[PDB]
Amino acid sequence: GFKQDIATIRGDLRTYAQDIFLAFLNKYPDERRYFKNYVGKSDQELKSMAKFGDHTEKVFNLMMEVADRATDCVPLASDANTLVQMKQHSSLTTGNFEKLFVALVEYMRASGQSFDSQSWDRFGKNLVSALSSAGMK
Amino acid sequence: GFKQDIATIRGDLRTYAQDIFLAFLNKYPDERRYFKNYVGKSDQELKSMAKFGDHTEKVFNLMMEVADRATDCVPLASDANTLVQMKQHSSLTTGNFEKLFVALVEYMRASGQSFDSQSWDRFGKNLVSALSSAGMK
Ligand code: HEM
Ligand code: HEM
Ligand SMILES: Oc1c(Br)cc(Br)cc1Br
Ligand SMILES: Oc1c(Br)cc(Br)cc1Br
Structure with missing residues (x-):
């Protein structure tokens, strides 16, 4: 269930974080605009940038x-x-x-x-x- | 579901409230000690009390x-x-x-x-x- 999923993700946090984030940018490419230093950079180029x-x-x-x-x-x-x-x-x-x-x-x-x-x-x-409720539009 | 059950209970509140509270007191008769004048009374007696x-x-x-x-x-x-x-x-x-x-x-x-x-x-x-979480023991 949900609690196990947290354990699955935490167990390999860097891999899941990168894969899910890239899935997000791939599905919604215009969202990359909020991350200016990732524009024009392939997945492998990204993963070689410390930030x-x-x-x-x-x-x-x-x-x-x-x-x-x-x-x-x-x-x-x-x-x-x-x-x-x-x-x-x-x-x-x-x-x-x-x-x-x-x-x-x-x-x-x-x-x-x-x-x-x-x-x-x-x-x-x-x-x-x-x-x-906390004020985000 | 849960949301609709709230409407069901509200639709016949005093009947459900008495029935459920009686079920509680009959299952756990010692819980009458937190209340005044509930001991020594049948369900019908309780339901005719003022309060x-x-x-x-x-x-x-x-x-x-x-x-x-x-x-x-x-x-x-x-x-x-x-x-x-x-x-x-x-x-x-x-x-x-x-x-x-x-x-x-x-x-x-x-x-x-x-x-x-x-x-x-x-x-x-x-x-x-x-x-x-709110501090009840
Ligand atoms: C629950 C969802 C999210 C959580 C937990 C979250 C958490 C964070 C955290 C902790 C940082 C700081 C990282 C650091 O300084 O190293 C951050 C930075 C940022 N986040 Fe969010 N975020 C969330 C959703 C979003 C979404 C939906 C967007 C945009 C679509 C977004 C855009 C940014 C940007 C542009 C930065 C600055 C980049 C950086 O320097 O890290 N985040 N996020
Ligand atoms: C979600 C659960 C509960 C809610 C919403 C709740 C709510 C209330 C409310 C609104 C009153 C004021 C009633 C009035 O003055 O007419 C009250 C009184 C009281 N409650 Fe609670 N209650 C809850 C659970 C309990 C439990 C578990 C006990 C004890 C086992 C308890 C014992 C009392 C007592 C002793 C009074 C005052 C004496 C009496 O009303 O006869 N309640 N409750
Ligand atoms: O901050 C984010 C988190 Br946490 C997950 C995904 Br997917 C995208 C962003 Br931006
Ligand atoms: O009002 C009550 C609720 Br709500 C739960 C239990 Br248990 C006992 C009483 Br009285």
């Missing part, structure tokens, strides 16, 4: 913390607030987060590995509601 | 609001805090609530009406967790 592996792992580490602190896929409002008031997220809307979770779920469903993808979808919906 | 129906309606009125404000059967922390801080609940521990929800779930399973009894069980467990 790409660092960014992505840290993003997914925080996502996994928020996921682990949730109850029945309902995140803490305090965690939603952290995400909204990060300077790096200042120009985002809940739609950018909905896109990430659509890509993450699609990726889970397409993988060899046995994810509770319904629960990630629900977590994503609950997180979007909470981001909105 | 029994009124008190018990007020309990279920609030229980249904807590359930309605929940997401995925997870109550709000502010609702848990209210229940912990109420002067009328100063003698209570989370075990008292656990027992109430066990009886409530067992009433729903036995009833002729189509309740989502698994969701009420989850809600009760999540409420006990939230009461603990």
Whole structure:
């Protein structure tokens, strides 16, 4: 289930973080505009840039913390607030987060590995509601 | 489902509230010691008391609001805090609530009406967790 999925992802965090992030950018290419230093760079070029592996792992580490602190896929409002008031997220809307979770779920469903993808979808919906409540447009 | 069950209970609140609260007191007769003048009385006696129906309606009125404000059967922390801080609940521990929800779930399973009894069980467990988080012993 969802708790096992957190363990699966954490076990190989750098690989899953990179693969899911690239799945997100591939499905929604116009989203790459928010990551100016990744424009025009192939996947292998990205993975040789220190900040790409660092960014992505840290993003997914925080996502996994928020996921682990949730109850029945309902995140803490305090965690939603952290995400909204990060300077790096200042120009985002809940739609950018909905896109990430659509890509993450699609990726889970397409993988060899046995994810509770319904629960990630629900977590994503609950997180979007909470981001909105914490002031994200 | 859970959401509709809230509407079902609200639609015949004083009847369901008395029936469920009676199921609780009959399953756990020692729980009458937190209340005044309940011992030594049959169900019909209790239901003709001045205060029994009124008190018990007020309990279920609030229980249904807590359930309605929940997401995925997870109550709000502010609702848990209210229940912990109420002067009328100063003698209570989370075990008292656990027992109430066990009886409530067992009433729903036995009833002729189509309740989502698994969701009420989850809600009760999540409420006990939230009461603990809010500092109830
Ligand atoms: C739950 C979802 C997300 C979590 C947990 C999250 C977490 C983070 C974290 C922890 C950082 C800082 C990393 C660092 O400084 O090394 C960050 C940076 C950033 N995030 Fe988010 N993020 C989320 C969703 C998004 C989405 C949906 C977008 C855009 C579509 C976005 C765009 C950015 C950008 C542009 C940066 C700056 C790049 C960097 O220096 O790391 N993030 N994210
Ligand atoms: C979600 C569960 C519960 C809710 C929403 C709740 C709500 C309330 C409310 C609104 C009152 C005020 C009633 C009034 O003054 O008319 C109350 C009183 C009280 N409650 Fe709770 N309650 C809950 C669980 C419990 C449990 C598990 C116990 C004990 C086993 C308990 C014991 C009392 C007592 C002793 C009073 C005052 C005496 C009385 O009303 O007869 N309640 N409850
Ligand atoms: O910050 C994130 C982004 Br941007 C995309 C995906 Br997919 C996951 C996270 Br966390
Ligand atoms: O009002 C309640 C009483 Br009195 C006991 C249990 Br257990 C649960 C509720 Br709600």
